[PDB]
Design a binder for this molecule. Structure first.
Ligand code: A1ACL
Ligand code: A1ACL
Ligand code: CL
Ligand code: CL
Lengths: 124, 4, 124, 4
């Protein structure tokens, strides 16, 4: 085509989706990770995660307002990944890298899994 | 704005 | 903070939101522009437009499944802007620039309004 | 990935 492109558009959209999440606007699901609860937009979760994409395209699960994750999933690891989904920024640290990588593997977030593997390999 |  | 950032994350999210729109997945509103109907995600519309942000933060309008735009709004102009919201690419042409600018003014999409003004000024 |  002969379209023009606004470079900062995708980043501006994601910033506004994060502002709606912070103010709890039009969030349509609560993700339960052991004792912890996280409110989010189903569309953003599907856009970032192979696991959520599979869950919310399922004819019965698409209508659930609550999703319970596997008990082995660490709430902090999930929180860090949820923040990444809405911001592009990953808070990866020596003390959380194992939980972040295991959670990214479960959630099917291949680019996160890749950077965790590289950061671990460098420390060995 | 750019030419993509 | 000490976060790492994935450069292509925002663009990848927007690409997946557009794929869900094309397949009509989790769309929660229909925008009526005269005889034409456009299905979309309320969150993406709010993230891109000052007008939709005001409409869907309203305690009564937030629950409507149908929104009717002003009869002066051109359906093609709306279609071009909706495509821009989901892609960052604006199909601006000599034959549509007036309709695109009027629609962007109504929708409160200031970056689109700005490029339309500059393209018009250059043709004068 | 980059240092933002
Ligand atoms: O590592 C990842 C990140 C990811 C996201 C999604 N999301 C989507 N993919 C295709 N079309 C659509 Cl419509 C969506 Cl929402 C699927 C798989 C994976 N894997
Ligand atoms: O030109 C534009 C584009 C635009 C988008 C929005 N959106 C939001 N702004 C602030 N927080 C939130 Cl939560 C959203 Cl969704 C508001 C005004 C405008 N004006
Ligand atoms: Cl990822
Ligand atoms: Cl804009």
């Amino acid at each position: 085509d002969s379209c023009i492109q606004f470079t900062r558009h995708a980043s501006d959209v994601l910033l506004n989706l994060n502002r709606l999440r912070s103010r709890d606007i039009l969030t349509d699901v609560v993700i339960v990770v052991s004792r912890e609860q996280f409110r989010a937009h189903k569309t953003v979760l599907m856009a970032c995660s192979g696991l959520f994409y599979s869950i919310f395209t399922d004819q019965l699960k698409c209508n659930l307002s609550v999703i319970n994750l596997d008990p082995e999933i660490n709430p902090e690891g999930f929180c860090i990944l949820l923040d990444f989904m809405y911001t592009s920024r990953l808070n990866l640290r020596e003390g959380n890298i194992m939980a972040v990588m295991a959670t990214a593997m479960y959630l099917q977030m291949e680019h996160v899994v890749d950077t965790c593997r590289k950061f671990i390999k460098a420390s060995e | 704005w750019v030419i993509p």
